[PDB]
């Protein structure tokens, strides 16, 4: 081999549980079929495999054999998954670990991006990492949890579809397509979180990292700059007065990342509260804006604030670039800086001179300001 | 078949967790059984 181990792995995999054996076989098949950047192994002891708090410990009994698969991505980084099994519950869980080749100097506001409690929380829409899937286990635990979730791992739905468990006996045909779809989703999720890590490391220094590709999306000169980018907490988000509509719409759930950007010009402060759900680059961040310039011009008492929120939130697909579109948040922040420049310069009376070539200042019943940019001629029209 | 690949040297995992002489003797029994 320097100029085999599969037989030893088969002799070890003889003693695996049936969902773990199905996961091992399908993972080896998918690794030999398409993606050679995948490795599986079995960790445990074959001697144990041969075979009222004590009731809680023996109910939450981990199987001594566990499987461990790691992926390498095209960012000299790897993702390690360890699947564990619970024979008393018929539920298999996962622990995760993202490690890069570099030292990975993390910024302050990164935080829960790569924290292994909540990396893979919402691969599919929802699933929360919290609740057990089958209600028979809910009735069994009612006859007798999140700390044990942090101790053992997260019982997702996609993990159990990888194992073959169908919850309304393991099946390879149930594992087949779900294998390739979930491995593609993991490969996108880790790259998205590393790109957000790089962007947050740049955004803490007051600089919006724009690429060479996205330069046609924005005008050349910009005056408004980002001075603060601080992650906040959920309850801190719900304490804000100008974010009632996101909460009442059902978009401010528990499993989100909540940020505060602060953008200024001369005596002009704009607080932008940002919601990310963990399916980034497939579901955009949502923004709320409060301009503390003269009095308090907010979303309820001004319509151009609502127009800027419509330009950022609803029209986000103009800002996504190539197929690995992980640059969406920076494009939204740069567009919102441009919109603050337009809102301050095109306002009729003079602290800010109007240098825009808008050619018409208002239109419509709501007296709308021009917020659409036109690149080959470079001028602002209305939406 | 599975025995063809066991004779060929390839070992594939089954769904639930001296070959040469035995397979050729089973061929010898199968031919005599079908002719009989």
């Amino acid at each position: 081999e320097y100029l085999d181990q599969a037989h030893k792995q088969y002799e070890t995999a003889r003693h695996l549980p049936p969902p773990l054996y199905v996961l091992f076989v399908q993972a080896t098949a998918y690794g030999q079929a398409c993606d050679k950047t995948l490795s599986v192994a079995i960790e445990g002891s074959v001697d144990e495999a041969k075979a009222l708090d004590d009731k809680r410990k023996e109910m939450l009994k981990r199987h001594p054999l566990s499987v461990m698969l790691d992926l390498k991505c095209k960012d000299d980084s790897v993702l390690h998954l360890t699947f564990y099994y619970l024979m008393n519950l018929n539920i298999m869980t996962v622990k995760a670990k993202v490690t890069t080749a570099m030292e990975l100097i993390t910024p302050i506001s990164a935080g829960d991006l790569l924290s292994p409690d909540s990396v893979l929380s919402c691969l599919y829409p929802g699933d929360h990492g919290k609740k057990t899937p089958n209600p028979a286990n809910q009735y069994q635990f009612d006859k007798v949890l999140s700390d044990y979730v942090l101790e053992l791992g997260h019982p997702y739905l996609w993990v159990q579809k990888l194992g073959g468990l169908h919850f309304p006996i393991a099946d390879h045909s149930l594992s087949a397509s779900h294998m390739e779809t979930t491995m593609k989703l993991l490969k996108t999720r880790v790259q998205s979180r590393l790109a957000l890590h790089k962007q947050f490391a740049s955004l803490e220094h007051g600089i919006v990292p724009v690429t060479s590709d996205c330069q046609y999306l924005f005008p050349a000169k910009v005056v408004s700059r980002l001075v603060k980018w601080v992650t906040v907490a959920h309850e801190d988000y719900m304490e804000l007065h100008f974010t009632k509509d996101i909460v009442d719409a059902g978009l401010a759930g528990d499993t989100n990342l909540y940020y505060m950007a602060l953008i200024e010009r001369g005596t002009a402060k704009l607080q932008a509260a940002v919601v990310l759900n963990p399916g980034y680059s497939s579901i955009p961040p949502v923004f709320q804006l409060c301009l503390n310039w003269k009095g308090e011009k907010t979303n309820s008492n001004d319509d151009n604030i609502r127009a800027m929120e419509g330009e950022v939130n609803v029209c986000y697909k103009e800002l996504c670039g190539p197929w690995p579109s992980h640059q969406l948040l920076t494009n939204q922040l740069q567009r919102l800086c441009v919109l603050l420049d337009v809102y301050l310069e095109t306002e009729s009376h003079k602290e800010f001179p109007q240098e825009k070539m808008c050619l018409r200042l208002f239109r419509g019943p709501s007296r709308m300001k021009p917020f659409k940019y036109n690149h080959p001629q470079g001028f602002f029209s209305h939406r | 078949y599975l025995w063809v690949q066991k004779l060929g040297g390839l070992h594939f995992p089954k769904e639930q967790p001296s070959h040469m002489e035995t397979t050729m003797k089973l061929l010898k029994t199968r031919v005599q059984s079908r002719l009989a």
Binding site: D4, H7 | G9, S18, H19
Partner: peptide, 28 residues
């Protein structure tokens, strides 16, 4: 092509030796 045929012959000989070792481990 001659070097590739020699390398393929060496690889087939190594595979035959591994198969003989596997047959010896299965028989014993």
């Amino acid at each position: 092509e001659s070097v590739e045929d020699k390398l393929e012959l060496r690889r087939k000989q190594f595979h035959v030796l591994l198969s003989t070792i596997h047959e010896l481990q299965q028989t014993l």
